[PDB]
Every structure is written in C-alpha cells, then in structure tokens.
C-alpha cells in the first residue's frame, strides 16, 4: 500500500504563469504515476500517464517529470480553463491517487452584479416563502451577507451557497436564500438583499417590492 | 467506443450492504481489468478495488475486510459489494479499465450512493424570475430554485442543455435533513425565448422541467 | 539527378519519445524538402511542406528543420497513432524520395488472443483443407507457431503472415494457415496450434478434433 | 474535390509493356502538373516519369529508356507506359499532382500491377467459425479465409461497413503461386446477429459475400 503525498493542496496564480504540483511516493514506484485534471461534477481526466507521456490531445503546455519517489506537474502559461483540480496516481504497485491540489487563478478584480428574486407565486400557494438573491461573476471572491427586512438584519433564515471559480471568466458567484414562513412574508414589506464587496465603497443595495403581483 | 456504466442506490441504510454494477461496453473483461474508485463529496479520489483481466481481486488495505470484486464475463459487468457500511462510505463511486498498457483512462459517470437511515425526499422546484415590477434590464438573470431535497446529488440544465449560457449551478447545502440548491442563468430573448430548467433527482428517480415564466 | 540518404531505416522509439528521422541531399536543394507519411495499404500523405511548413493536418508535435544538405522531421511525442513509415522527397530539381524509415513503438507485454478454425465443409467439398490459428493484439512482434497433428509437428502447408504493429494498440496480430489435401485432413485426428510467446512461460496450444465436427 | 485515380490492366507478363492511365479531377492539368511514383510491395516509393502544367515531360535518370508519359490535358488524364517488365517492376503505381506550389499535395489510390507469367485466378472465401466442441466467451473471433486467388489486390470488409472494428485483415501471402489471405473480426452478438465478410477480388470480377454461420 504505496502513500502518495501530493503537495500543492491550493495553488494561486495569474494567467500565464507555469505552475508545478510533485507527488512523492511513500515506495519507489518507478515510473507509474499519473496525472488528471478534474472540473465538478464530471469524472477525472487523465492528461499524463508514465510521469511525462502525454495523454493524446492534451495541450503541450503540461508536462511531467519524475522517478522513484519523486515526481512533477507542471503547466506553463496557465489558462483561464486549466483552473480545476488535480491529482496524482501511482499505478506501479497497485493504485494510490494524492490528495489533489485546487489550482486558482488570479484575475482582474471584478464586482458582482447582485440580483433578487421574491417567492414564486407558485410556493407561495403551498404556504411557504422563499427569498433568494444572486450576485453572480466577482473576483475576489471575498463577499458580505445582509438580510435587511423593514429595516430590521434578521440571519435566523439564511443559506449562503459560493460557487466554484468559474474556468471561464476567472470569478465567483454566490447565492443567498432566504427563507421564511409564508405568513412571516405578509408582516413585511421592505425585502433589501444588499452586499458589499471590497470593490464598492458602500453596499450594493438590492431591494424588491413585496406588494406587485 | 469504449465506454463503462456503473448502476446501483443512491441511498443506502447503515450496516447494510451497498452492491454496485459496473457495465463495460468497447472492450472485453477479459483482456481489461476493472477498478472501484470512490470520491467522498467535496473530497478527492480513493482507489478501492481492482478485478484483474484473469479474475483476480485487489483492495485498498483500509477495506480490503468488508470489501468484495467479481465479474460475469458472459455479460460484460464488474460488481462491488460492501457491508458494514457507514456514513463517511456516501460518495460518487466510480469504475476504470486497465488494459495492462492504459490505466485509469476510461470511467464510468459514476454514481453517487449515500449512507443514511433518512428516507429519500424529491426536490421542490421553484422558478426565479422578477419581481412583479422590477423592470428587465435587456439581459435578464433567471434560476429555479431546486430545495428540500436528499439525499445529493440532483443537477440541472436549461432548455435541454442548449442554453449553458452562464450556469452558475450553486453547491447544495443541507437543512436540517435536506438539501437546498439554486442554478442560475442569464439571458436577453427571454421573455419572448422560453427558458426553462432541466432538474433531476436520481436517489429519486424524478425529473422536474420548471418553465420559468413572466411576471 | 540528385541522391536523398535517409536515416534511420527503422525505429523502435518508447512512447512519448522524441523521434528525428533524417535525409541528406546530395546537392544543394535550398529548402525543397517535404516530408510524408503512409500507414499501411494507404497512399502516402504529407505532413511537412518546404523543410518547416507545417501543412494541415498535420498536429503541431511534428516540425522540419534543416540546412541546405542537411535535413530532418522531428516528433516530440511520439504517439501510438504515428506508427508508419516516412519519407522525404527532394523537389529541388526533378524529384526524389528517401528510402523511408519505419516507425514502430515499444509497449508493454501484451499476450496474443489465440483462436483455432476447422475447415469449412465447402472447402473440403473441394478436396482440400485449411485450419486457420490466430494470434491476435500481442506485443512484442517475435512470436512462434507450429502446428502439431496428433502430436506431429506439419511444417508443411503452412502460411504465416503477420501484421504491421497497429498504430492504434502497438500491437501485432498473426495468421497461420495449415493446408493439405481433404485426404490427408480426414485421416487425422487432433489439430493443435502452440503458440511460443514470452508471455507465456508454458506454450499456449489451442486445439480442436476433426471425429467432433 | 480535387482527386486523382489510377487506372489500368494490373496484370502483365515478363517482358510485356504496361499501360496505365491517371485521371484527375477538381483541377486542370493545364495549370498542374503530374507525376507518377511507383512502390514495390515492403520497398519504398519511387518517382519515375512526371509531366509539366505545359505538357512537358520528365522521367527517373534510370528508368528513363524504358519510359513515356503523356496526357489528354482535354480529358483531363496522363498516360505512362513502362517497356519491357520483370518482376521487381511489380508494385502500386500512385500519380500525384504538382501545380508549382504544393508539390505532391493530392496522390491516388495506386494501382497494383503485377508483372507475373501466372494467370488471373478469383479467390475462394471460406467461413471461419469455432466449433467442434470448443468453448465461447460471448465475445468471439470469427473470419474468412479468402484463398487461392491471382494476383493482387482483394478488398474485405465486413457487414458492408457496420462497425468494422477489431478487423484483422492479414497481408496476403504468396504460397504455392497463389495468394491468401485471413480477415478477423470480433463478435459479441453473433450468431444472433449476423456477421457476414464482403470479398472482392476485381482482378476476376469477383465480388462475393460469405455469411459467417454456425
């Protein structure tokens, strides 16, 4: 039962850098070690198998290099699309994967651009009530919370959700749902989402209604 | 054309035992051997069991007790079966060939199962579009809101998956007892373009098409 | 007209290697080279154009370099899909090809799939007999089949013909084909294959008996 | 839609002159040129012969006495004509174009010829099928033996095209004065669903298909 340690477990960087993840081998696997490149919710990818064979149609930016104990990852002038988890995997006796590493990348800085959302008429019928606001695409991903209903902060309601940095556009998204009874909605009137970023100097304000439709 | 499929329960009871099913399809048992890989959720990859192209059983040492791999080469599949099942055994389990020359290559989709005595709950799917007043600003932001769920996972697409636009799919969080996630996706023909969420719950084995309206 | 020495004739390269085959003008040629490619029954196609100029198709792990005299292809990484032959051509005055060289790759042990076929009574109908062994998808290349009948090795009749290493597994496959006449078939009664393979350890025998047809 | 094709009697006897023809196509031979390069069966590629966009011509300082090329710029095709045959003449003739810029860009199929004394034999495609007592593993290796035919080449695939995959088709090999050759593929669902080769030997016009039963 050969341990691999695999060391980066988060890596931060800017578009264009070469970054590099090792893996060592409690044993002298050999050769045998892998590399793959894992986005959420979908099934491992393999980009290099034997330390530095490339797995056809991986782009030649990545690379391995290894022996024995001791082995390297690395991808030189990073893009927007390689942020995603890695691992490493020994195959010489057995199989053993690494802990992985979250590789990040650092953007420009961006400001979220905060949505709100009343219950829909259709839970509202069923008695209940369910307030949720979006700010979605922001960098960093460092975001305040804020329930004002008529003035008043309440937080015994709230579930905050951030999501994964999109390999798209380098940001975050997050989301915030309220929830509360369907007769607790009707003794208010006043719904302030409300955020402030380190990119705002204030908050960002954004209310509904309640009356309407 | 080489493909694997892994069948099984979203959500089993403790103590139980869970049996999986990998289906393999471009390639022969018999010259391919087949692996278990695990993934808790949030966690990362935990090889488990290897079937070689003979027919002979490996597994990881931290389970290599309540663990068994067989297969019915007559039909192509691989079966895992584990008991004395616990909590921390709830994540997406996988299977891979191994060809003797190419490893790890070929997975399955996998297959989430969760360890719990709780009983499956399907999602409440809501539509989020404007308030009743709040003008559109051209490009509108719209979601659902897929909540009061379990066990994980339930993933959701729009328009069938021809929108894509800006998904921001957002990670479920439990309540409680149950799950609450929202998928959200921006887009301008909308009024007039029909948006709409594809939720799915496979614990459950229910799928929910929530048109987000007008208002 | 003008003499084109290539080298190497042939080549076993490890996956991932980085592969140069090289072609020597015996004159002046400027930068009149290109270079082709052929996989077996296929006509030859062209990778590289004017000793660098990549033509499409052609992925960027392939590049042509040279000077004046002096010239090669390079494969940064060679994949199991480059197996084949290659070829420069000269088309600085009249033209000229290399002798070419062939491209094999080495793999890791694969034991052949052995699979042994009586006669069709169609063909005994006809007064002869063919019993076809196959060896198929095996690595390495060297391999050894004699036919035993009820227990005596029949050197005669037999047919070999094996593969070129298939570019898409690095593997070989083999034919045999035991002939004689339906007389000399009938009178007979256990047909075994044997094959000899490094994989093996004990000969692997595949065998069928004509009273069971 | 540029495309060239060969084509012409792929059988001669020692000593006797060959005719080939090499039409093309999406282009005029008015503004390309054609060559014509010839690969012995194992050997490499040879050019011999090549005519210029004008309709000038240009052959392999060593073969050059025994040969002639031309065209019919008009029906868009270019002639070669070999004096003289001996057996290490056999080989594919391939015609390619030139045009001044991309050289050898677009080639043909190749034509096999034959220079032989043999004469013109069709093939014999038989089943190749387990039996006999034997096993199975639901996924099995089945084949046609196509044997006994003259000269090269013949053509196999299998279920006219439905998934052609793991098919082995052999070299042919030369024994006794005649070819043979073995195609293989690899079932999972036969004999329920049929398995069935397709066989051409165009050299006897012989275009034949052998089910695979059992």
């Known amino acids: 039962d050969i341990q691999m340690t695999q060391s980066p477990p988060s890596l931060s960087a800017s578009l264009g850098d070469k970054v590099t993840i090792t893996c060592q081998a409690s044993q002298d696997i050999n050769k045998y070690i892998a590399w793959y490149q894992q986005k959420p919710g979908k099934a491992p990818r393999q980009?290099?198998?034997?330390?530095?064979?490339?797995?056809l149609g991986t782009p030649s930016r990545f690379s391995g290099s290894g022996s024995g104990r001791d082995f390297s990852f690395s991808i030189s002038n990073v893009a927007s699309e390689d942020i995603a988890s890695?691992?490493?995997?020994?195959?010489?006796?057995?199989?053993?994967?690494?802990?992985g590493t979250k590789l990040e990348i650092k953007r420009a800085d961006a400001a979220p651009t905060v949505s709100i959302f009343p219950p829909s008429t259709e839970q509202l019928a069923t008695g209940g009530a369910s307030v949720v606001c979006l700010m979605n695409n922001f960098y960093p991903r460092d975001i305040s919370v804020k329930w004002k209903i008529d003035g008043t902060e309440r937080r015994d309601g709230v579930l905050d959700s951030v999501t994964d940095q999109d390999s798209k556009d380098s940001t975050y998204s997050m989301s915030s749902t309220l929830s509360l009874t369907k007769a607790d909605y009707e003794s208010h009137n006043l719904y302030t989402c409300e955020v402030v970023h380190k990119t705002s100097s204030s908050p960002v304000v954004k209310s509904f209604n309640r009356n309407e439709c | 054309e080489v493909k694997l499929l892994e069948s099984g329960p979203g959500l089993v009871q403790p103590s139980q035992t869970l049996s999986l099913t990998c289906?393999?399809?471009?390639?022969?048992?018999?010259?391919?051997?087949?692996?278990?890989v695990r993934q808790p959720p949030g966690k990362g990859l935990e090889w488990?069991?290897?079937?070689?192209?003979?027919?002979?059983?490996?597994?990881?040492s931290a389970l290599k007790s309540r663990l068994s791999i067989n297969r019915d080469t007559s039909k192509s599949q691989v079966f895992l079966k584990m008991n004395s099942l616990q909590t921390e055994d709830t994540a997406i389990?996988?299977?891979?060939?191994?060809?003797?020359?190419?490893?790890?290559?070929?997975?399955?989709?996998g297959t989430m199962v969760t360890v719990s005595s709780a009983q499956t709950t399907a999602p409440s799917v809501y539509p989020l579009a404007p308030g009743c007043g709040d003008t559109t600003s051209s490009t509108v932001t719209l979601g659902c809101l897929v909540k009061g769920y379990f066990p994980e996972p339930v993933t959701v697409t729009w328009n069938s998956g021809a929108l894509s636009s800006d998904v921001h799919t957002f990670p479920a969080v439990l309540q409680s007892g149950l799950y609450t996630l929202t998928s959200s996706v921006t887009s301008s023909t909308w009024p007039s373009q029909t948006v709409t969420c594809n939720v799915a719950h496979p614990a459950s084995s229910t799928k929910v098409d929530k048109k987000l309206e007008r208002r | 007209d003008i003499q084109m020495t290539q080298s190497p004739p042939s080549l076993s390269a490890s996956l991932g290697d980085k592969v140069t085959i090289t072609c020597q003008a015996s004159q002046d040629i400027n930068k009149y080279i290109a270079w082709y490619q052929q996989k077996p029954g296929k006509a030859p196609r062209q990778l590289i154009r004017?000793?660098?100029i990549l033509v499409l198709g052609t992925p960027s792990r392939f590049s042509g370099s040279g000077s004046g005299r002096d010239f090669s292809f390079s494969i940064s990484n060679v994949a199991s899909e480059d197996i084949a032959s290659y070829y420069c051509?000269?088309?600085?005055?009249?033209?000229?090809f290399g002798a070419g060289t062939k491209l094999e790759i080495k793999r890791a042990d694969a034991a052949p799939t052995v699979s042994i076929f009586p006669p069709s009574t169609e063909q005994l109908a006809t007064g002869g007999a063919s019993v076809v062994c196959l060896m198929n998808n095996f690595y390495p290349r060297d391999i050894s089949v004699k036919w035993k009948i009820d227990g005596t090795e029949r050197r005669d009749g037999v047919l070999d013909s094996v593969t070129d290493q298939d570019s898409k597994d690095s593997t070989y496959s083999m034919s045999s084909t035991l002939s004689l006449t339906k007389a000399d078939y009938e009178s007979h009664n256990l047909y075994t294959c044997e094959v000899v393979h490094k994989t093996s350890s004990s000969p692997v025998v595949k065998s069928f008996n004509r009273n069971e047809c | 839609e540029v495309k060239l094709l060969e084509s012409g009697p792929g059988l001669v006897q020692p000593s006797q002159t060959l005719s080939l023809t090499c039409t093309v196509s999406?282009?005029?031979?008015?503004?390309?040129?054609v060559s014509w390069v010839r690969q012995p069966p194992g050997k490499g590629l040879e050019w011999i012969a090549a005519?210029?966009?004008?309709?000038?011509?240009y052959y392999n300082s060593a073969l050059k006495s025994r040969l002639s090329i031309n065209r019919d710029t008009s029906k868009s095709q270019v002639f070669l004509k070999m004096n003289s045959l001996q057996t290490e003449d056999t080989a594919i003739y391939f015609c390619?174009?030139?045009?001044?810029?991309?050289?050898?860009?677009?080639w043909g199929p190749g034509t096999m010829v034959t220079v032989s004394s043999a004469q013109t034999t069709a093939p014999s495609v038989y089943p190749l099928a387990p039996g006999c007592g034997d096993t199975t593993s639901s996924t099995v290796t089945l084949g046609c033996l196509v044997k006994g035919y003259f000269p090269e080449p013949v053509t196999v695939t299998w279920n006219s095209g439905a998934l052609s995959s793991d098919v082995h088709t052999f070299p042919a090999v030369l024994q006794s004065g005649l070819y043979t050759l073995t195609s293989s593929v690899t079932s999972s669902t036969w004999p329920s669903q049929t398995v069935t080769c397709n066989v051409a030997h165009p050299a006897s016009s012989t275009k034949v298909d052998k089910k695979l039963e059992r």
């Open positions: 005519i210029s966009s004008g309709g000038s011509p």
């Open positions: 004017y000793t660098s």
């Open positions: 999406g282009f005029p031979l008015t503004t390309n040129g």
């Open positions: 051509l000269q088309y600085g005055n009249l033209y000229t």
């Open positions: 390619t174009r030139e045009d001044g810029w991309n050289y050898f860009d677009y």
